[PDB]
Amino acid sequence: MPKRHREHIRKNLNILVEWTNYERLAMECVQQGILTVQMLRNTQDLNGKPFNMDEKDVRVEQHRRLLLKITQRGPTAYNLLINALRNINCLDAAVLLESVDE
Amino acid sequence: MPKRHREHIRKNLNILVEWTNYERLAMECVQQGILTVQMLRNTQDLNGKPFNMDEKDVRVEQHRRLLLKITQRGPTAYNLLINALRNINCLDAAVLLESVDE
Amino acid sequence: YQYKDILSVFEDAFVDNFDCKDVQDMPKSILSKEEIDHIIMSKDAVSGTLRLFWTLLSKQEEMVQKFVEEVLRINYKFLMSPIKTEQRQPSMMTRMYIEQRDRLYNDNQVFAKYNVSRLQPYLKLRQALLELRPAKNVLIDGVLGSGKTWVALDVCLSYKVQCKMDFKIFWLNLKNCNSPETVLEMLQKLLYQIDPNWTSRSDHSSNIKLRIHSIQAELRRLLKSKPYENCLLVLLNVQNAKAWNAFNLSCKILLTTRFKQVTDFLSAATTTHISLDHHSMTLTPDEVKSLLLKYLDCRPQDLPREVLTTNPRRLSIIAESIRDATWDNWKHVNCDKLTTIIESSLNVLEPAEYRKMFDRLSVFPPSAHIPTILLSLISDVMVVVNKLHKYSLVEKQPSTISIPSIYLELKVKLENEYALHRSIVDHYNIPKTFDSDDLIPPYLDQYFYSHIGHHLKNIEHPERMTLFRMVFLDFRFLEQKIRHNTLQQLKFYKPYICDDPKYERLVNAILDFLPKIYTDLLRIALMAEDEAIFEEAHKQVQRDNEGRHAVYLHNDFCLIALASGQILLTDVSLEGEDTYLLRDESDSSDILRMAVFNQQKHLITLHCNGSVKLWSLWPDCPGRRHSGGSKQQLVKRFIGSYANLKIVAFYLNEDAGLPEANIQLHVAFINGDWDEQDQEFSHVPVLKTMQSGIRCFVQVLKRYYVVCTSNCTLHVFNVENDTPLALDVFDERSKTATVLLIFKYSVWFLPGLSVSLQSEAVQLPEITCGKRSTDRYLLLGTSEGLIVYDLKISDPVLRSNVSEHIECVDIYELFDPVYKYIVLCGAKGKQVVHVLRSV
Amino acid sequence: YQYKDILSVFEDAFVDNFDCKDVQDMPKSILSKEEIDHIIMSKDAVSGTLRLFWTLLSKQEEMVQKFVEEVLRINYKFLMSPIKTEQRQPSMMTRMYIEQRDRLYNDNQVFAKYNVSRLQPYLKLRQALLELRPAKNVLIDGVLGSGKTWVALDVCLSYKVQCKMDFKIFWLNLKNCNSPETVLEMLQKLLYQIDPNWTSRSDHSSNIKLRIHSIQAELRRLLKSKPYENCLLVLLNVQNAKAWNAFNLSCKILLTTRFKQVTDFLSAATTTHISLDHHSMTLTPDEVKSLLLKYLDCRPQDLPREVLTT
């Protein structure tokens, strides 16, 4: 997708990382048809040394590891991400995503 | 900026340096977002030659050097200097600057 | 269509978004664990992509269907429609890519099977490949015989580069490019590669240069074409830059010469220079461990064999001989085939001056440097060696010179007349010229101090006794101080004794005295009198086990390889450093990750050994396999199950945590329930900061026994795991272990770091006090003097080790000397009456 | 693409705005001490920006971006736009200049690595070249082997004149160019490089003079073309004036000579004359130490040689 979705996602990462549940999103996207044998998590695994800082704030980066990945695909994924948030029901983030387009 | 701006500043440097106070315009422009401490140091340094002539021929030459610097520096040199001169309340200089436009 | 060609087309998509390292399914028979698991340690997504697309491409075609059709399609729907489309429809671009790749394989017929792709060089090449200007050129060089042809083929098959070049690739081997007709025929053949048509009327044989510039003009004018805007001309083994001066046709050409002369002319900005004689260029022997798999295809036999660094020609031919005896064909065989190629590239040298001098060079040891004077005897000489350096042969450096072992030993030792008489009489004469009134010569550190031994053993015995200075004493000072060692001096002393027995016994006693340890040298020589060392020391004045160092900061973690031979040393400048005990041969200087200050642990036998730093983490590693295996960060003192059958890695975090895990598995088994902690056979002693001990049950995990140490005002087990010690402020208290309840105190300064040993109840306090044989008295003070302050000591079973000073200098001492010889004395405080002297 | 080549596009803009004197925002990593000392002392920021750009291209490609993306930020705002936009987009004429300069560097491969830019004589050179006239030419003398072959290569590398030159430049190593046949094959090379197509039916071996006149007329016809309006012809080590008399095509050409007689023949008014045997035409010890460092490649031993001036 164009760079506008890139900038929108990177800017609203800090917000959609908290509005939508990480597990409820990832476990809804793996069945959605993006993250499989070739992609799976790529977020539950990290550089290998995240334990210097505590798990409560660790989650904040783990879910941060998800959205930054979702941007890397082609033009469909953005709208597919729309669809993903439609499964999330945290639609206050879905409308925030919508606001940058249309 | 168009060369007409720079040419107008060169040909009308004398009147402008006459009207405008040096320190007041300097502080207004550096606050306006036009200068930094490094560049204004050299701007007030004039030439080093200020030693041999009298002080009376230093401040005016410093001011014309400032005018010559602020010809092209600044995202909107014409507009931002117009604003700074309006802040000076030496509005004759501001309107003389605006004369080359419109 | 094919199902093994469509994957490389989407290598762009794979690098962009795909990472096969999030897999938790990996259906075993999908791919061998080793291949996919060494992709886990891939440097980046590009490296993982390359590793996957190479290992998977090595697999058979029908298995990729299980990879894709069902394993990938767990619930994907996303990027399998393009792959399946390419399998069935196959775009014209993709079809031409596959056809061109198949044509190349069909042209080489040897790279299709005998390729083991080297990730590092291709990785360092393809970024320049993708940014090549429509007329810029790329140079690849290094050392010849490095299989650079194979590297070029590896980068050639890449989908990205073929797409960028639009499959406009033409390979020309630049063999024998030292004659006008030899390049003329290459011009015609490359023209016909572009198009087998020629307006040959302009061919005027009055000057072959006339025709060569005419055809160069024709090639230039045709190359300026829209289909010909991006073309890749491979220039295999460029002979000289002169040939390129005709082959410079202003295109995206890649030339890979094998001569040092060619690369110098080309500018790095104009031509991105690439060399192959680098550690990074050399990758790892694990890269070539599959050579027997590409040739003989026998995985188990690779372990019995031992592969070397990147030498595809020599190593490949040795393996080919091996598959057609591993050891017989390693060295003895290949003397007729490997030599054929090793001096096949030589033949360009004229022998009147070049080959004769290179043969003269054979007398020098296989891996040795050389002073300029010595080669001069055997500026014409320096001009000759300089041009030889230019061609391919000799490496030059500031102002000695090193010579590669490949050309020094095998090529010329086999074919060598007896010029050795003159060479060795000169090798005798020059050190005789290197004689003074004293015994201090202007010896050169590398060649002289090392190979004077070789040459003097070579000539005769009286020279051997005289100039080694073991009859004298100056060798012991000069060599050791100038070599900073003792191992090299011993390695000279031992094998050279063959060149009279009366002096052989004396020098044998010298050799024995050498590992045992101006005015100092004469004083120590005075100790030995039957040896003529003090005899020489008189003329000079009128006119402990072993040692280590190799380091940059401050001695941390002293240990012992269970099986009498290795030290898992380690220091403070992040670097590894492991060493032999009877050799000190630095075996692996490998920075784990955080060389700070804490601890190391072994296992029951071997195969795991990581030392936790001050970043909680206690990462583990293998033995001679070295490469760190386990990353563990949650943490302090943890020990392996003392039973050899149960590999239970008992772990201990903070807040009295009890994680337990079998090393054979990757997950903690038991996670039940702060300064230092221990387990028992149902009890847990931990000590913490209040300096009062705490004793818990493994089963109920509450407070039951508190030793306040009763004298407030570090825990470790013994040779029976029955004696835990509690260190508190100023007390050592032998705590129990599900057998009894408290044993001994022994009325012990603050205990800095006191630990146990591995035997007879005795434990070690270090260096405040000495060896206290608990259950009570003190035997030794590390038993071999001080030689300053710190010097470690322990007993694994019956051999001893322990390496950690502070001043970069750890020392291995032994029980036998005992009784603290020089330091157990009357201290600094004394008064003197110059009576003799009553002191 | 590359940050290295695009900077030469905007030197004028820097000369327009970049102070090169008041810009004191020291990056210790890239901007060195001695070179900033020299950057302060330059007579102006036209030449100042020039050898500043030389020092910048001396640094590696990425190393300079730190200056132009964040170090430039505090003291300037414009310049990032006109350089980063070209860094991505790369205009067509700029790209053409890029391939042309790369062709020239690939033409040498030796001056491409061992060069040192003699500032002031080159300054005079390209200054005379600003008002280069379609009929005018430039003589460059000096004793043979004085590197005037180097500075002749350098002077055409300038972005501004090359763009003004419409990127058509050709060279002719006039070694042993004193035969009626030599001029023949050289003009045949000219014919090919101008156009790899011609009519060979006018080949008249009865007279080398007749055929050389015929090819001269053909090339004169070629040059008087809109695509051939300003094409440079370099005459490298001109042997004798007869070569030029065969080469005077009334074009934007020039020549460097080995001989005093060549310069003596040409009229100064009709032909600009430049020498090297002059107090400012020779090399300052700074240029000398730079050139010796091009080979020695270590400053610690650079101090160990302060004698030669040849």
Side-chain angles (χ1 to χ4, degrees), chain D residues 197-205 207-209:
Chain D
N197 289 274
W198 47 84
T199 72
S200 306
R201 281 79 51 84
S202 294
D203 171 82
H204 299 157
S205 179
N207 297 123
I208 187 65
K209 187 269 183 182

PDB file of all heavy atoms in Angstrom, chain D residues 197-209, unseen atoms left out:
ATOM      1  N   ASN D 197      27.916   5.671 -38.503  1.00  0.00           N
ATOM      2  CA  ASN D 197      27.359   5.458 -39.829  1.00  0.00           C
ATOM      3  C   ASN D 197      27.901   6.537 -40.750  1.00  0.00           C
ATOM      4  O   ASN D 197      27.994   7.705 -40.361  1.00  0.00           O
ATOM      5  CB  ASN D 197      25.828   5.498 -39.818  1.00  0.00           C
ATOM      6  CG  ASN D 197      25.219   4.289 -39.147  1.00  0.00           C
ATOM      7  OD1 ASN D 197      25.005   3.256 -39.780  1.00  0.00           O
ATOM      8  ND2 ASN D 197      24.942   4.408 -37.854  1.00  0.00           N
ATOM      9  N   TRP D 198      28.262   6.139 -41.965  1.00  0.00           N
ATOM     10  CA  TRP D 198      28.881   7.047 -42.919  1.00  0.00           C
ATOM     11  C   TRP D 198      28.889   6.386 -44.286  1.00  0.00           C
ATOM     12  O   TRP D 198      28.578   5.201 -44.427  1.00  0.00           O
ATOM     13  CB  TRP D 198      30.306   7.411 -42.501  1.00  0.00           C
ATOM     14  CG  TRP D 198      31.099   6.212 -42.114  1.00  0.00           C
ATOM     15  CD1 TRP D 198      31.769   5.367 -42.946  1.00  0.00           C
ATOM     16  CD2 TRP D 198      31.304   5.716 -40.787  1.00  0.00           C
ATOM     17  NE1 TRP D 198      32.379   4.372 -42.220  1.00  0.00           N
ATOM     18  CE2 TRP D 198      32.109   4.567 -40.891  1.00  0.00           C
ATOM     19  CE3 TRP D 198      30.890   6.135 -39.522  1.00  0.00           C
ATOM     20  CZ2 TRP D 198      32.503   3.831 -39.778  1.00  0.00           C
ATOM     21  CZ3 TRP D 198      31.279   5.404 -38.424  1.00  0.00           C
ATOM     22  CH2 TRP D 198      32.078   4.268 -38.555  1.00  0.00           C
ATOM     23  N   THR D 199      29.257   7.175 -45.291  1.00  0.00           N
ATOM     24  CA  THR D 199      29.411   6.696 -46.658  1.00  0.00           C
ATOM     25  C   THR D 199      30.901   6.614 -46.966  1.00  0.00           C
ATOM     26  O   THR D 199      31.581   7.642 -47.047  1.00  0.00           O
ATOM     27  CB  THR D 199      28.699   7.619 -47.641  1.00  0.00           C
ATOM     28  OG1 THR D 199      29.421   8.852 -47.747  1.00  0.00           O
ATOM     29  CG2 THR D 199      27.289   7.910 -47.157  1.00  0.00           C
ATOM     30  N   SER D 200      31.405   5.396 -47.138  1.00  0.00           N
ATOM     31  CA  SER D 200      32.815   5.169 -47.429  1.00  0.00           C
ATOM     32  C   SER D 200      33.132   5.260 -48.917  1.00  0.00           C
ATOM     33  O   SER D 200      34.283   5.035 -49.307  1.00  0.00           O
ATOM     34  CB  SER D 200      33.248   3.805 -46.886  1.00  0.00           C
ATOM     35  OG  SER D 200      32.931   3.680 -45.510  1.00  0.00           O
ATOM     36  N   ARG D 201      32.140   5.583 -49.747  1.00  0.00           N
ATOM     37  CA  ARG D 201      32.337   5.622 -51.191  1.00  0.00           C
ATOM     38  C   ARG D 201      33.229   6.775 -51.629  1.00  0.00           C
ATOM     39  O   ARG D 201      33.727   6.760 -52.760  1.00  0.00           O
ATOM     40  CB  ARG D 201      30.985   5.715 -51.896  1.00  0.00           C
ATOM     41  CG  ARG D 201      30.242   4.392 -52.000  1.00  0.00           C
ATOM     42  CD  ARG D 201      29.549   4.046 -50.692  1.00  0.00           C
ATOM     43  NE  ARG D 201      28.731   5.150 -50.206  1.00  0.00           N
ATOM     44  CZ  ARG D 201      27.490   5.393 -50.602  1.00  0.00           C
ATOM     45  NH1 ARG D 201      26.886   4.624 -51.492  1.00  0.00           N
ATOM     46  NH2 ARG D 201      26.839   6.435 -50.094  1.00  0.00           N
ATOM     47  N   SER D 202      33.443   7.763 -50.769  1.00  0.00           N
ATOM     48  CA  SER D 202      34.310   8.889 -51.081  1.00  0.00           C
ATOM     49  C   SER D 202      35.771   8.610 -50.761  1.00  0.00           C
ATOM     50  O   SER D 202      36.609   9.501 -50.933  1.00  0.00           O
ATOM     51  CB  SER D 202      33.842  10.140 -50.330  1.00  0.00           C
ATOM     52  OG  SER D 202      32.572  10.562 -50.794  1.00  0.00           O
ATOM     53  N   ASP D 203      36.090   7.404 -50.289  1.00  0.00           N
ATOM     54  CA  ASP D 203      37.468   7.019 -50.011  1.00  0.00           C
ATOM     55  C   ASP D 203      38.311   7.104 -51.274  1.00  0.00           C
ATOM     56  O   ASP D 203      38.112   6.330 -52.216  1.00  0.00           O
ATOM     57  CB  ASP D 203      37.525   5.603 -49.434  1.00  0.00           C
ATOM     58  CG  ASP D 203      38.941   5.070 -49.341  1.00  0.00           C
ATOM     59  OD1 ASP D 203      39.643   5.407 -48.365  1.00  0.00           O
ATOM     60  OD2 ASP D 203      39.353   4.315 -50.247  1.00  0.00           O
ATOM     61  N   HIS D 204      39.255   8.040 -51.302  1.00  0.00           N
ATOM     62  CA  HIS D 204      40.080   8.301 -52.477  1.00  0.00           C
ATOM     63  C   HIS D 204      41.540   8.165 -52.059  1.00  0.00           C
ATOM     64  O   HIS D 204      42.156   9.120 -51.577  1.00  0.00           O
ATOM     65  CB  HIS D 204      39.762   9.676 -53.053  1.00  0.00           C
ATOM     66  CG  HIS D 204      38.337   9.822 -53.491  1.00  0.00           C
ATOM     67  ND1 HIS D 204      37.711  11.045 -53.605  1.00  0.00           N
ATOM     68  CD2 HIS D 204      37.413   8.895 -53.840  1.00  0.00           C
ATOM     69  CE1 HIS D 204      36.465  10.866 -54.006  1.00  0.00           C
ATOM     70  NE2 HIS D 204      36.259   9.570 -54.155  1.00  0.00           N
ATOM     71  N   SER D 205      42.089   6.964 -52.247  1.00  0.00           N
ATOM     72  CA  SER D 205      43.461   6.674 -51.847  1.00  0.00           C
ATOM     73  C   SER D 205      44.490   7.370 -52.722  1.00  0.00           C
ATOM     74  O   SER D 205      45.677   7.357 -52.378  1.00  0.00           O
ATOM     75  CB  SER D 205      43.707   5.166 -51.865  1.00  0.00           C
ATOM     76  OG  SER D 205      45.045   4.869 -51.509  1.00  0.00           O
ATOM     77  N   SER D 206      44.070   7.968 -53.839  1.00  0.00           N
ATOM     78  CA  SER D 206      45.011   8.693 -54.684  1.00  0.00           C
ATOM     79  C   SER D 206      45.638   9.862 -53.940  1.00  0.00           C
ATOM     80  O   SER D 206      46.795  10.214 -54.201  1.00  0.00           O
ATOM     81  CB  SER D 206      44.311   9.182 -55.951  1.00  0.00           C
ATOM     82  N   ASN D 207      44.902  10.473 -53.016  1.00  0.00           N
ATOM     83  CA  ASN D 207      45.415  11.595 -52.244  1.00  0.00           C
ATOM     84  C   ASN D 207      44.952  11.469 -50.803  1.00  0.00           C
ATOM     85  O   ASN D 207      43.748  11.500 -50.530  1.00  0.00           O
ATOM     86  CB  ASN D 207      44.955  12.930 -52.834  1.00  0.00           C
ATOM     87  CG  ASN D 207      45.489  13.161 -54.229  1.00  0.00           C
ATOM     88  OD1 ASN D 207      44.726  13.374 -55.170  1.00  0.00           O
ATOM     89  ND2 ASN D 207      46.807  13.117 -54.372  1.00  0.00           N
ATOM     90  N   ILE D 208      45.911  11.332 -49.885  1.00  0.00           N
ATOM     91  CA  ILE D 208      45.600  11.479 -48.469  1.00  0.00           C
ATOM     92  C   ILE D 208      45.070  12.874 -48.190  1.00  0.00           C
ATOM     93  O   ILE D 208      44.213  13.056 -47.319  1.00  0.00           O
ATOM     94  CB  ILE D 208      46.838  11.153 -47.606  1.00  0.00           C
ATOM     95  CG1 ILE D 208      46.476  11.132 -46.118  1.00  0.00           C
ATOM     96  CG2 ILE D 208      47.973  12.129 -47.877  1.00  0.00           C
ATOM     97  CD1 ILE D 208      45.523  10.047 -45.723  1.00  0.00           C
ATOM     98  N   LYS D 209      45.554  13.879 -48.924  1.00  0.00           N
ATOM     99  CA  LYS D 209      45.043  15.229 -48.733  1.00  0.00           C
ATOM    100  C   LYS D 209      43.591  15.333 -49.175  1.00  0.00           C
ATOM    101  O   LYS D 209      42.773  15.955 -48.491  1.00  0.00           O
ATOM    102  CB  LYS D 209      45.898  16.242 -49.493  1.00  0.00           C
ATOM    103  CG  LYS D 209      45.522  17.689 -49.187  1.00  0.00           C
ATOM    104  CD  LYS D 209      44.472  18.231 -50.150  1.00  0.00           C
ATOM    105  CE  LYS D 209      44.164  19.689 -49.873  1.00  0.00           C
ATOM    106  NZ  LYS D 209      43.112  20.204 -50.790  1.00  0.00           N
TER     107      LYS D 209
END
